[PDB]
């Protein structure tokens, strides 16, 4: 009756919002996680909308 | 009914961010295997075993001396 979705409880792996590739990072700032200092360069640089599109990709937001 | 503990299985490599632990793969084979080894020892090993406590069974060995 529309109960039918499910969670899950298994702890989740992280991937880079970026390029997708895994992730060992997340940056305490813009909370985007991020492969490598080469993205992480990119991140902070962004155009100040785009790093809550990066999170809004995956349904996160900042606020 | 000996065991050992592998690791951390990495499918929980996330649990934390850092953890001091140590994540492996799971095994990809099969979770059963049989194997027969033929054993070799010695009388002189059968002396040693039964003469003292060895290996595990002696920690306090770890003071030297006496």
């Given at each position: 009756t529309n109960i039918e979705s499910a969670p899950s409880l298994a702890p989740m792996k992280h991937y880079c919002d970026v390029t997708g590739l895994p992730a060992p990072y997340l940056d305490p700032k813009t909370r985007l996680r991020y492969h490598n200092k080469e993205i992480f360069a990119m991140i902070r640089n962004?155009?100040?909308?785009?790093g809550e599109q990066f999170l809004e990709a995956r349904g996160a937001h900042t606020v | 009914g000996a065991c050992k503990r592998v690791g951390r299985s990495d499918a929980y490599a996330t649990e934390f961010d850092l953890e001091a632990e140590e994540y492996v793969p799971i095994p990809k084979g099969e979770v059963h295997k049989k194997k027969e080894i033929v054993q070799d020892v010695t009388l002189h090993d059968l002396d040693v075993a039964n003469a003292r406590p060895q290996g595990g069974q002696d920690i306090i060995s770890m003071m030297g001396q006496l």
């Open positions: 962004l155009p100040q909308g785009m | -």
